[PDB]
Design a protein around this ligand. Sequence first.
Ligand SMILES: CCCCCCCC/C=C\CCCCCCCC(=O)OC[C@H](O)CO
Ligand SMILES: CCCCCCCC/C=C\CCCCCCCC(=O)OC[C@H](O)CO
Ligand SMILES: CCCCCCCC/C=C\CCCCCCCC(=O)OC[C@H](O)CO
Ligand SMILES: CCCCCCCC/C=C\CCCCCCCC(=O)OC[C@H](O)CO
Length: 201
Amino acid sequence: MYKPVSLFLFFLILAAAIHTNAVQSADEAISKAAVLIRQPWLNEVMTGITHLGASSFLLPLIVIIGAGMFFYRKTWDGLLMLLVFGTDRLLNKVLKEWIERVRPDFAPLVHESSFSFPSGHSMNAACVYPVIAYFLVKHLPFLSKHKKMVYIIAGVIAVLVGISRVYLGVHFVTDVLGGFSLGLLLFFLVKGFDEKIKRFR
Ligand SMILES: CCCCCCCC/C=C\CCCCCCCC(=O)OC[C@H](O)CO
Ligand SMILES: CCCCCCCC/C=C\CCCCCCCC(=O)OC[C@H](O)CO
Ligand SMILES: CCCCCCCC/C=C\CCCCCCCC(=O)OC[C@H](O)CO
Ligand SMILES: CCCCCCCC/C=C\CCCCCCCC(=O)OC[C@H](O)CO
């Protein structure tokens, strides 16, 4: 359907475009321009923000939220959340090792030990936070009438995580957009599935 196909097509176009010198040059220019806004206090804040996208943070977060939902509503939907997360990490790893993009390496503020495209923190955040939002709104009746705000929070968090990877000099903008599009794709897939299997609307 429209939204996951558009994101998939957007990723393919980006995966091709990063091989053009025009995009590589714009990616370099934006990466270096981000250094100009840096301050040490903001370096610290952005490092804290970026941890919200770390798989070492999101795995215990998903397990905690899923456990909470199990006690509160007896749902096993936390297993769906773990599955889409694992799918997300597997897909990011396979694409990274296939594409083998070199990292910016102008001015990194955090450590990395892998290829650059697509960004795993951005892919993690664009998948997990909208997914969490979906299942929280599904299972927490006190979040009804706050649904738009829950999803806005998930979107703000994911965007900030992506911004932080460019700020911290470890991803190019296109790495972030590539990870955004595929994490969001996985979100729409698991949301569409969960809604499709409902026996009452
Ligand atoms: C959701 C839309 C429908 C489905 C998705 C298909 C269309 C995606 C839209 C724009 C892709 C832009 C990609 C961003 C990278 C820019 C690519 C580019 O402009 O390349 C210029 C070329 O390199 C000069 O030599
Ligand atoms: C127009 C809307 C539909 C778009 C559908 C297709 C658009 C993207 C094309 C192929 C995707 C696969 C990308 C694979 C990467 C190709 C570039 C590449 O591999 O370059 C390597 C070569 O060694 C250079 O040195
Ligand atoms: C009603 C029950 C369902 C809702 C669930 C209620 C709680 C969910 C809300 C906040 C969780 C905050 C948890 C903070 C995340 C901890 C992640 C962690 O442990 O971090 C590991 C560290 O990063 C290693 O590198
Ligand atoms: C109607 C749509 C049909 C789709 C319906 C399901 C919704 C999609 C969600 C998850 C896919 C499940 C695939 C499970 C693959 C798990 C892979 C895994 O856990 O690997 C961990 C990772 O490799 C550590 O590095």
